[model samples]
Target: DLSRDECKRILRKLELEAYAGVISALRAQGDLTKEKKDLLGELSKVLSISTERHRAEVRRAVNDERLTTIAHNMSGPNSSSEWSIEGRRLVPLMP
Candidate 1:
């Protein structure tokens, strides 16, 4: 929905904590820095998208995971058959 230069232009008007929230989300600085440095730039792209949403998505996407099943329950329904749209369908592996 947003272009690169447009994205860049969009973020020029914020305080942003300057990667502060990203650091807070990961709960690491040195460890984060130890990985691919270009990730900073990549993350910069992510951050520049929208102040709140980008930060929120970053936090949600990085939350601690449990080795367990996660589900939204029902697939999108159309005409009661409730099939996925063409190639993108959810067929339950478990009843």
Candidate 2:
């Protein structure tokens, strides 16, 4: 069994690599627009996988100290906006 710190480190590295993979794929597809990049960052921050095994891995890596550190690093004033959803059309907050 891996130690807690080892698991956390590995999971963090995996998550970072997965996010980078997404960016690379988008760029390769010629869809790396500025707006798309911003959306990708936001989506990465809020992304949650709906898998039992993945959830277990995440939970195993989540410690009180790590959670506190992440919260402190991310705490800041943020803006919120709304988006519109219509039939067969999904519009973002900005044009």
Q: Against the unseen true structure, what C-alpha lDDT does each candidate score? A: 0.36, 0.40
In candidate 2, residue 82 scores what lDDT? Answer: 11
Per-residue alpha-carbon lDDT of model 1 for 10-67, expressed as tens digits? 6764435555455343332212232422454456565553434434433433342310
Give the TM-scores of the predictions, in the order they appear.
0.23, 0.42
Candidate 2 — which residues are off by over 4 angstroms?
47-95
Q: Across residues 1-95, which tens digit of lDDT does each residue of candidate 2 receive?
A: 99999998898778766755554344333323457646654655554322332323223323234433443355422101110011112233222
Instruction: Name the candidate that leads on lDDT.
Output: 2
lDDT of 1 at 88: 30
* lDDT agreement of model 2 with the native: 0.40
